[PDB]
Every structure is written in C-alpha cells, then in structure tokens.
Amino acid sequence: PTVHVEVHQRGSSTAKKEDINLSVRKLLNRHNIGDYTWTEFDEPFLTRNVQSVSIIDDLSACTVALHIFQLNEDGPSSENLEEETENIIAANHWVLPAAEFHGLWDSLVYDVEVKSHLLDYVMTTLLFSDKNVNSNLITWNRVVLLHGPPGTGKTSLCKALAQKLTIRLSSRYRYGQLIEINSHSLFSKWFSESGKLVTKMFQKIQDLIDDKDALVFVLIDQVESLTAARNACRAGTEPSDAIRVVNAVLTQIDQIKRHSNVVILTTSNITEKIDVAFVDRADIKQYIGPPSAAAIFKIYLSCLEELMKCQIIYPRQQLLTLRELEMIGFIENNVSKLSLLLNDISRKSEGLSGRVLRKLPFLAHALYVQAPTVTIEGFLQALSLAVDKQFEERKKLA
Amino acid sequence: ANHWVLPAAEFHGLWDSLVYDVEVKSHLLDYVMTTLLFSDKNVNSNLITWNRVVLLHGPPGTGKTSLCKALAQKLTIRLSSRYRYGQLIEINSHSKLVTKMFQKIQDLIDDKDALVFVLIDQVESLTAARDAIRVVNAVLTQIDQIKRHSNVVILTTSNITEKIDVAFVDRADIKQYIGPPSAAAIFKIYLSCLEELMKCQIIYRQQLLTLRELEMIGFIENNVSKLSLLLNDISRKSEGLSGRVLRKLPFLAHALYVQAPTVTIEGFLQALSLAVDKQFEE
Ligand SMILES: Nc1ncnc2c1ncn2[C@@H]1O[C@H](COP(=O)(O)OP(=O)(O)OP(O)(O)=S)[C@@H](O)[C@H]1O
Numbered sequence: 001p002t003v004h005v006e007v008h009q010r011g012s013s014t015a016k017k018e019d020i021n022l023s024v025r026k027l028l029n030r031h032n033i034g035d036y037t038w039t040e041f042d043e044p045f046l047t048r049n050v051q052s053v054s055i056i057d058d059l060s061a062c063t064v065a066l067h068i069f070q071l072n073e074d075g076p077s078s079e080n081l082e083e084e085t086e087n088i089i090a091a092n093h094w095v096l097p098a099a100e101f102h103g104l105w106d107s108l109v110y111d112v113e114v115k116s117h118l119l120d121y122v123m124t125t126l127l128f129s130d131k132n133v134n135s136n137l138i139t140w141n142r143v144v145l146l147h148g149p150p151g152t153g154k155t156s157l158c159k160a161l162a163q164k165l166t167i168r169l170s171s172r173y174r175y176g177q178l179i180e181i182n183s184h185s186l187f188s189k190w191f192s193e194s195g196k197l198v199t200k201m202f203q204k205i206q207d208l209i210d211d212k213d214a215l216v217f218v219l220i221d222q223v224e225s226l227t228a229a230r231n232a233c234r235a236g237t238e239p240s241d242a243i244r245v246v247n248a249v250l251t252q253i254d255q256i257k258r259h260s261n262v263v264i265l266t267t268s269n270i271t272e273k274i275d276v277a278f279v280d281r282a283d284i285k286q287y288i289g290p291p292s293a294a295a296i297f298k299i300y301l302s303c304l305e306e307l308m309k310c311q312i313i314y315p316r317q318q319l320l321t322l323r324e325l326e327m328i329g330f331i332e333n334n335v336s337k338l339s340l341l342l343n344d345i346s347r348k349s350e351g352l353s354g355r356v357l358r359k360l361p362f363l364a365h366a367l368y369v370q371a372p373t374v375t376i377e378g379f380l381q382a383l384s385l386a387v388d389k390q391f392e393e394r395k396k397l398a
Numbered sequence: 399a400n401h402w403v404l405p406a407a408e409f410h411g412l413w414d415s416l417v418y419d420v421e422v423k424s425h426l427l428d429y430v431m432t433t434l435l436f437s438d439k440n441v442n443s444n445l446i447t448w449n450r451v452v453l454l455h456g457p458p459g460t461g462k463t464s465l466c467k468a469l470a471q472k473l474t475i476r477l478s479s480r481y482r483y484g485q486l487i488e489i490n491s492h493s494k495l496v497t498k499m500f501q502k503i504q505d506l507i508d509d510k511d512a513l514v515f516v517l518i519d520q521v522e523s524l525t526a527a528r529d530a531i532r533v534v535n536a537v538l539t540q541i542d543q544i545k546r547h548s549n550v551v552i553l554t555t556s557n558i559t560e561k562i563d564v565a566f567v568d569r570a571d572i573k574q575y576i577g578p579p580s581a582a583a584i585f586k587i588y589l590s591c592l593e594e595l596m597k598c599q600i601i602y603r604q605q606l607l608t609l610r611e612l613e614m615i616g617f618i619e620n621n622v623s624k625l626s627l628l629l630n631d632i633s634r635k636s637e638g639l640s641g642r643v644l645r646k647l648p649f650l651a652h653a654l655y656v657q658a659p660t661v662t663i664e665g666f667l668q669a670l671s672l673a674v675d676k677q678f679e680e
Pocket residue numbers: 107108109110150151152153154155156157221291295299353354355356358444445
C-alpha cells in the first residue's frame with residue numbers, strides 16, 4: 001500500500017541511485033518491522049554510502065518508496081546586479097537539498113500541522129499536473145502565504161518544505177534551487193531601488209526556471225516590504241513607487257503561473273495592511289502565532305535529548321512526552337519529576353519565539369553554569385531562571 | 399592581516415586592562431566558554447541557536463578589538479585544556495591576501511588543541527569607502543564554510559553601530575552593545591595622555607596613581623590621590639564622551655587655561671574639569 005522512505009548519503013560516496021536503492025531495500029527486508037532512524041549499519045556497503053534512513057511523516061510489507069539525496073556544502077552563491085558597481089544587491093541563493101538544512105524539516109513543530117497541509121499541497125499539485133487538468137477550467141496560482149509574530153521559524157518552515165519535497169522529487173528532478181532576496185532591497189525602498197530590482201530578480205528566476213530537471217522554490221520573506229496598502233493616506237511621500245512594486249510582484253507571479261515546477265512561499269510580519277491583492281492572491285493563507293504548550297514541551301524534549309546525545313548532558317536520562325505524562329496519571333514519581341517540572345516550565349514559558357525558544361539553553365548555561373561539567377536536575381532550575389530573565393528583558397524593551 | 403599566538407606575552411595582561419560598565423568580562427566569557435562547549439559535540443545546529451561570531455558595536459576604539467584580543471588571551475587562559483595552543487589573526491579591511499589567509503586559517507584549524515580565532519576589524523565598514531568585492535565575498539564564504547570546524551572562533555568587530563547589512567551580522571547569534579567606558583577606563587586614557595605629557599615636562603612631576611594604585615592605597619586622599627575625586631569629577635558627567643573626544647579633551651584643556659609652555663598638573667586638571675564642563679553644557 002502506502003509506504004515512503006528517505007535515504008541520506010555520505011558526500012564522498014559516489015554509488016548510483018539503483019545500487020544504494022537495492023541496498024536500502026535489502027535492509028528493509030532484513031528488518032521487515034513507531035518511526036525509526038537507521039544510522040548504524042551492519043552492512044558495510046551502507047556505511048560506505050548511506051548515513052541515515054528515517055521514517056518521515058510498525059508495518060513494513062508495502063510498496064518500497066526510497067529516495068536517495070546527497071547534501072551539498074555550497075551555502076552561498078552570486079545573485080545581484082553585474083553591470084558595474086553592483087555587489088551588495090544581495091539576493092541570497094541556495095542549491096536544492098544542499099547540506100545546510102538537514103533534519104530541519106522535523107526540526108520545527110506546529111500543532112496546527114500546517115506541515116501535512118503544505119506537503120500534500122504540492123503532492124496533489126503534481127497529481128493534477130500529471131492528469132493534465134485543463135488549466136483555465138480549474139486554476140490555481142502557485143502562491144502560498146503564511147504570516148504571524150516575527151521570528152516564528154517562518155523562513156525556516158519554508159526551507160524545510162523545500163528540502164522535504166526535494167527528497168520527494170529526486171524521482172522527478174535532478175535537483176532544484178532556492179531563492180531568497182529578502183531584506184536586502186526590502187528595507188531601502190528608493191526610486192526603482194525596489195522596482196527595477198524586482199524586474200531583475202524575476203528575470204533571474206524566469207531563466208533559472210525552465211530546467212524541468214530542477215524544482216524551484218521562490219522564497220519572499222518580508223512581504224510587508226512589498227505592499228503599498230493602495231495609499232491608505234493621501235501622503236504619497238513614498239506611496240507611488242510602492243504601488244509599482246506591488247504591481248511588478250503580482251504581474252511576475254501571474255506570468256510565471258505557467259511553469260510546471262515553480263512554488264512560491266511568502267511570509268509577513270504585520271498581521272494586516274499587508275495587501276489587498278496577495279491576501280486575495282493567496283492559494284492558502286496562514287497565521288502561526290506563538291506555539292502552544294504542546295510544541296513548547298516538544299522543543300524542550302528535543303533540545304534535552306540532543307544535549308544528552310551530545311554528552312553535554314552527561315548522564316543520559318529519559319523523559320515522557322505529553323500524552324505519555326498524561327498516561328502516568330500525573331504521579332509525581334522518580335521519572336516524572338523532571339518531566340512535570342518541564343511541563344510547568346512550558347506553562348510559565350508561554351508566548352515566546354522559536355528564536356528565543358531554541359536560544360534559551362545557551363544563555364542559560366552562560367549566566368548560570370559556564371561549565372561542561374554539568375548535568376540535569378540543575379540545568380532545569382538554571383534554565384528556568386534564565387527564562388525569567390528573558391521575560392524581564394522582553395519587558396525591558398517595554 | 400597579522401598574527402598572534404595565544405597566551406604568548408605580546409598582549410599579556412590586556413585582559414583586566416579594559417574594565418567596562420555593565421561585568422561584561424565574566425559575561426562575555428560565557429560566549430566562548432559555552433560556544434566551544436556546543437562546538438565540541440556538534441549539537442542540533444539546525445535546532446539549537448549558536449554561531450561562533452563575537453560581535454559588538456559602539457563608539458569606535460572603545461577597547462572592542464582590544465577586548466577581542468585579550469579575550470582570545472583569557473580564553474586560552476581558562477581553556478588551555480581543550481587547546482594546548484591556538485592562533486589569532488588580524489583580518490584587515492585594508493585590502494590575494496584573502497585566499498592564502500583563509501588557507502593559513504585552515505592550517506590553524508587542522509589541530510584539536512589549536513583554538514582558532516577569526517579577528518576582523520570594522521567588519522561592516524567594508525561598505526564605507528565603496529574592486530575589493532571578491533575580497534568581500536571570499537571572506538564571507540570562508541566565514542560561513544569554516545564555522546563547522548570546532549576549534550574555530552569568529553571574532554567580528556562592527557566598528558559601525560546598527561548600520562550593518564545582511565551578509566554579516568543578522569547572521570549573528572550573540573551580540574552586545576556597550577556605551578562609553580567607565581570612570582576607570584576614562585582614567586586610563588587620561589593616564590595615557592598624562593604620560594605623553596610627562597614625557598618631556600609638557601605638563602610638569604607626580605607619577606599617575608593608576609586605578610589599582612588608587613585601590614591599594616586604601617583611598618588616602620593626598621597630594622596626588624585627589625586625582626580620583628577630580629577624576630570622578632572629570633568622570634561625573636563624562637558619560638557620553640567619545641574616544642575621539644575623550645583624547646581630544648586634555649588637548650582642549652591645555653588650549654583654554656594653560657596658554658603656557660607648561661603648568662603644574664593640578665591647574666591642568668581643574669582646567670580639563672572646566673573644559674568637560676563646557677563640553678557637556680552642550
Ligand atoms: N515550531 C518550532 N519548532 C522549532 N524551532 C522553531 C519553531 N518555531 C520557530 N523555531 C525556531 O525559530 C528560529 C527563528 O528562525 P527565523 O527564520 O528567524 O524565524 P522566521 O520564521 O524566519 O521569522 P523571521 O521574520 O524570518 S526572523 C528558527 O531558527 C527555528 O529554529
């Protein structure tokens with residue numbers, strides 16, 4: 001029936017698709033038996049080729065759907081104006097599954113589970129595209145929009161989607177790309193320092209698109225830099241140029257709604273005022289506020305199990321998840337003290353930013369420990385004091 | 399574009415030599431003391447918030463690069479265990495040098511007991527006097543590409559307040575801003591001046607009762623210790639000066655009231671008091 005599995009590779013290894021495919025199939029057959037992350041390989045051919053094999057969201061006997069990528073170490077690249085005296089235009093670039101973003105998919109957590117939504121979005125996209133929907137009969141326009149409080153892992157989430165679909169589309173793409181021009185001329189807004197540059201960017205996009213053996217993620221954070229609100233005030237000190245900015249963006253999006261392999265992901269800080277078109281030129285809207293207690297506790301679990309995994313938490317302990325702690329009947333016992341304290345930590349950790357959230361432990365160990373010789377049961381209380389100080393600096397900005 | 403070995407005696411002692419307003423010694427320890435903690439075990443990078451990039455900004459020449467240097471010093475001091483030696487590098491905006499420079503930096507990285515440091519002056523001032531563009535992007539790519547090396551430490555120095563573009567410091571993970579130096583450091587700069595002046599009877603002697611000298615004497619307000627109070631006087635509202643204006647001050651004082659080949663220091667002292675009085679009537 002329905003089973004789909006991923007394959008992570010070592011850089012210097014250079015075996016072909018089919019060979020590693022057969023190898024991982026043989027491992028799946030040898031096991032034939034929740035998720036699991038194959039990283040320790042009896043088979044030395046695997047260790048020579050494969051790093052990890054994961055179960056991405058017990059039965060095994062199903063249609064083996066394997067996908068073998070290779071993380072690339074090239075992080076930056078050139079994308080700016082090239083005529084003369086032009087470097088700082090700063091259109092950040094990436095190649096597809098290149099290393100930087102490994103595991104970053106399952107990194108984030110959102111109880112709304114926009115993940116699955118966003119995923120089978122593009123899945124069903126290609127589905128229709130295969131069935132050759134007569135476009136103008138039933139039409140959809142390649143935009144996906146999110147927004148919320150700043151720093152909420154938004155750009156992160158975009159890139160995660162990119163990587164994950166990537167692994168889902170080596171079958172259909174040799175590679176792909178990622179664009180991010182955001183914040184460079186997204187805070188200047190001068191004469192065509194917006195417009196002309198948008199034309200240039202979508203020129204570059206247009207060209208870099210038509211590789212049908214390549215997928216395209218156009219990522220535009222800071223969309224609130226690309227809205228004019230249609231002059232909510234009759235003070236057009238800088239309303240005129242902004243109008244044209246908006247029109248450029250809309251027009252480019254449209255003109256490129258005719259490329260089989262183009263997905264655009266966009267995010268914004270301000271809740272409102274951000275457009276009248278985009279909001280209505282929006283295949284899918286989304287507001288992603290502060291994470292609930294669930295995601296907070298999950299992020300806690302994650303970082304804690306990592307620092308265990310890093311031996312930085314030296315005594316490797318074990319915790320209990322949300323419904324796991326629900327199962328113990330909230331019995332305050334030996335195992336449960338740390339986990340229930342962590343629950344109350346999340347509780348008194350309400351309304352924060354994933355930025356600050358997965359910032360916490362550094363400044364915690366900083367202001368409280370400054371020692372690799374440290375364990376849990378003190379790390380929690382020190383962390384809590386750190387978080388209180390974090391509240392106090394969030395109020396220190398008034 | 400220069401070199402330093404760790405604790406070797408070039409800047410031996412520069413550590414305490416820059417007392418700052420707001421514990422940043424013990425604080426900024428935490429930065430690397432935990433950065434290397436996390437850099438050891440290759441923690442969930444994608445998850446857990448770290449880079450290896452020191453960065454502050456403020457009034458230029460405020461012991462910032464100097465604190466970076468004495469910081470590499472104190473880092474080896476605290477942590478010669480994880481690093482039986484290490485290598486500090488002046489990467490100069492004055493500018494190929496970059497290619498073999500980061501090659502040498504790779505050499506530095508080659509060793510587990512080589513506490514690498516990446517010191518760059520005026521990191522964003524790259525866009526001040528602007529074909530050094532490949533210099534720019536080569537340094538950038540090297541930054542983002544040698545971070546994964548655990549013995550790497552990136553010592554960035556803004557030298558520009560909050561006017562920093564994307565490629566550099568929005569990349570940062572830990573930052574700090576500090577205003578004018580304390581009465582102590584103000585005093586030390588005054589001391590530099592008064593030594594330059596007592597170089598040739600320019601202001602003519604009483605050896606300068608330095609800060610720790612002020613402390614050891616148990617505050618015996620006497621012939622010279624009055625400096626302290628007048629120091630504090632000349633540090634009372636001195637909060638807000640710039641190092642440029644700081645060192646400019648004694649010059650201007652001598653300009654106003656001395657008008658002479660030389661006066662006894664005390665006249666100059668009250669003179670600079672009144673000069674700063676002017677300068678913060680502003
Ligand atoms: N649900 C989450 N799970 C794990 N990490 C999260 C989550 N939400 C946010 N984060 C973290 O928040 C950090 C902030 O990243 P950013 O990309 O700056 O946030 P953002 O969504 O891009 O918003 P901006 O405006 O682009 S900063 C990310 O590096 C994530 O690690």
